[PDB]
Amino acid sequence: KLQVEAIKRGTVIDHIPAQIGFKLLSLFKLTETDQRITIGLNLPSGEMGRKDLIKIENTFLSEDQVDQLALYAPQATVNRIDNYEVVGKSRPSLPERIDNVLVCPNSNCISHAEPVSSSFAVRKRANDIALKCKYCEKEFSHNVVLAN
């Protein structure tokens, strides 16, 4: 029945929203490996209607790595597979910091011209997420940071 068949061992990231799967692959450099990767984009979903799905064999993610998905796929389910068994499920939790992947919206921030990784402090607000740049110390809505 499954278009992208079951795997023996590794990680399956399920319940990724449409138009986010490819983004995850890019941002987190998931395809820079020799391990077998199988991907479904715009698959049907009961919970979600439609979804993306990423499988990476013989590869596992730390809780912190799973948490780095929070901003892009808050309802993702990260499945740890072994011997064709789901041996663990987890959901991303909003982490305390987000490194490398975001770009500071302050055009005068030193981060832009320079050999450093972006870094943001994360705090949840009532209707959005506030992201504070390590370098310029300005705090922006996640909606501003993610818009680029």
Partner: protein, 310 residues
């Protein structure tokens, strides 16, 4: 003679609704039927004390389309040194012995008005005086609105961007307020809101206006979307980053737009209008710029030629 013959053109607030209509009607005529020799043997001064390439080329092109000769300069090089202790008064007293009309742009408010007091019988046309007036921009804007909407009354007009410091939106608002039934929507960050004195003027005339945080709130009912530039130099870059989303336009924002709706911008539009808007039938900022030629011709013709153009 026509009502504007040998008149100075300094401020939108000195121009009546009848004057504005007369300029627009003359502009439509010259657009339909060129008169390339109307101002033959006139010499016009193009005096750009402050540089403004787009505005200057537009104006000089208009002079040539009517067959006039042009002399002039562009400074903003002698910005406050080299630029003499010689008064503007003296400069105008001299130049007004040379030419038949003076088109001038200047960094200080009131410069064109002062010029008229030393120009004798030589008309001066204000191409912009600091943060005060820019009447020919307003005239090309009105012509563009009139052409695309069929009228200057009973319109739904949205103005977006730096409403606080935009001389061009202040003047367009004053001009449209000379007509009846117009409805305004002001979309601006709090730090850059339309000034109270403009609001007071509308309230005094019983003209409806409302404030809105985004374009999407009113997209479905606007006939004119007049966008302006937010110059970064006044704002903190982080502040600019935080508010820019609400005064930026892209093609997808236009999904529910009326079929007649036109997007205007006095230019440059670099940040505010995404290039994907350019191909929509709503993009009208380049046509708007093109109409500068006809508005400026109309003005030159009316001021320098006694009889109405046919």
């Amino acid at each position: 003679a026509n009502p504007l013959y040998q008149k100075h053109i300094i401020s939108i607030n000195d121009l009546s609704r009848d004057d504005l209509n007369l300029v627009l009607a003359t502009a439509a005529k010259l657009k339909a039927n060129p008169q390339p020799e109307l101002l033959k043997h006139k010499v016009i001064a193009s005096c750009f004390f402050e540089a403004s390439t787009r505005t200057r080329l537009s104006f000089e092109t208009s002079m040539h389309r009517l067959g006039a000769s042009v002399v002039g300069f562009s400074d903003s090089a002698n910005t406050s040194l080299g630029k003499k202790g010689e008064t503007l008064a003296d400069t105008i007293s001299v130049i007004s012995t040379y030419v038949d009309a003076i088109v001038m742009r200047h960094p200080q408010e009131g410069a064109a008005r002062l010029a008229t007091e030393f120009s004798g019988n030589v008309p001066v046309l204000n191409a912009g005086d600091g943060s005060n007036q820019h009447p020919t921009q307003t005239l090309l804007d009105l012509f563009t609105i009139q052409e695309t909407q069929g009228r200057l009354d009973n319109l739904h007009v949205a103005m977006v961007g730096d409403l606080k410091y935009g001389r061009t939106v202040h003047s367009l608002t004053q001009a449209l307020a000379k007509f009846d039934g117009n409805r305004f929507y002001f979309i601006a960050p709090d730090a850059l809101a339309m000034p109270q004195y403009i609001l007071d003027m509308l309230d005094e005339k019983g003209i409806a206006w409302s404030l809105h945080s985004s374009i999407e709130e009113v997209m479905a009912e606007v006939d004119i979307l007049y966008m302006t530039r937010v110059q970064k130099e006044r704002l903190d870059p982080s502040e600019y980053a935080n508010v820019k989303a609400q005064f930026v336009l892209r093609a997808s924002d236009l999904h529910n737009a009326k079929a007649n709706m036109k997007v205007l911008h006095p230019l440059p539009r670099v940040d505010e209008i995404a290039t994907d808007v350019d191909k929509t039938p709503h993009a009208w900022y380049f046509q708007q710029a093109g109409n500068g030629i006809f508005a400026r011709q109309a003005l030159l013709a009316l001021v320098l030629n006694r009889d109405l153009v046919l």
